[model samples]
Target: MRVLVSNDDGVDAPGIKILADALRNAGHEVMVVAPDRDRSGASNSLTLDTPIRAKQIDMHTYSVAGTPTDCVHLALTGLLNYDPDIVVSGINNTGNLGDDVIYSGTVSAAMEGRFLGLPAVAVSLVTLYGQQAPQYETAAHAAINIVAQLKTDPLPADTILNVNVPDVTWQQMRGFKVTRLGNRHRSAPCLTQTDPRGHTIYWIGPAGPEQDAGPGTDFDAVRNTYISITPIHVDLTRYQALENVTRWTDRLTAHMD
Candidate 1:
């Protein structure tokens, strides 16, 4: 398999290193085109072209000073000069779970590929909050397993696999399972701070506690020591229930018409 990998964790992150190496050792061709710096929180808010430039690390590696989404676009739009067989993002340093995970650059890169009609996987290691270290090997192993299965069985090209593995070694893992994207409680309110100049500023508060992560949720899987694979298809539309909504619209239209 020819795999094109990118990350929001920056070009030099250990998680991407382990992931790229493992895939190469597994006999697949690998290429890296990742962010030059951390874009974990950049998401879609900043994808302009001012700083969007590529620095070649070596023949098979390139670094982009842009968002994870921009990294994938540069490669697929011909920075690498050709498309790889699969677009795999992450082996992210932090676990992206519960609600609002898609905002993560880890998942964003893979999503860009999916929107471009290729197989994509976003893998992350779900380490505990107070952990001393991240078990990236666990997530990389999970990536290899899923990438292999995907190449063999092949789901629709539109399916983006959002994978999260527990912070345990493979031997310690209970098993692997497929689950839905778990929702989360509303995030905590922003924090207030005073600058050196005596100006008040606001910072984003921490994410709220888990709220609706019951069975068959990504949150539950990792909490129970299983690898979680959530097959994602982008659908923000509110209508396969179109007619029901249309009735309401029709009523409103009658008044105006």
Candidate 2:
């Protein structure tokens, strides 16, 4: 199948290189279109105010001067001409488990493809400190294996698979685990900071502790040196919360006055 790969870590990132190389070696046509600079935390934003730019890097790679979403948008609408069979995003260097998924550009790129009604997947490495010689080969191999399975297996219509690999080498990794979201909490002061000029600005805090990583959670899988695969959905409707707010829709009619 034809695979389109993109990421938030920019085109030159080692993760992207490993991903592209592995996918290509797996006997599939691979095309990479990613951001020129690190667009981390960009999420699913589109560049509308300014003209976006695309630069051809080579036969298999291209760079975009916008967010991860824009790279996939342009690749789908302008470059690829035909819709690819699958959109494989990431091998991102950092973790994007749990609530962090909302702010993840790696997820954003895949979301863009999903928004266009295509099958997509996003993968990341769970790490606290920055990765040094990350186990990209493991991620790449797992992705290839996943892709092969996706060709026969079916996914739910509204969701994309979010996979997180452990920081350990492939041999050290326990195995694949199907998991769910977990919580991350912060401690102490969330206050303002200042530059050398004494400008006041705030810093929330560092990534909090993973207290909610209980059994059957993505965090637990990574912590135990296992690959975690979490199926996520576009459906945001809270069926439970509907009972609380279902009787409140009439309040919105006040604007008609």
Count the clashes in each prediction. Answer: 0, 0
Could you tell me every candidate's TM-score relative to the true structure? Answer: 0.87, 0.87
Give the clashing residue pairs of candidate 2, or none: none
C-alpha RMSD for every candidate: 3.2, 2.9
Please report, in order, the local distance difference test score of every candidate based on alpha carbons: 0.84, 0.83
Please list all clashing residue pairs in model 1, or write none if there are none. none
- When summed lDDT is taken over every stretch of 10 residues in candidate 2, the lowest stretch is 182-191
lDDT tens digits, residues 61-169, model 1?
A: 8899888888888888878776688899998888888676768789888888877777899988887776467888888988998899988988674678889989888
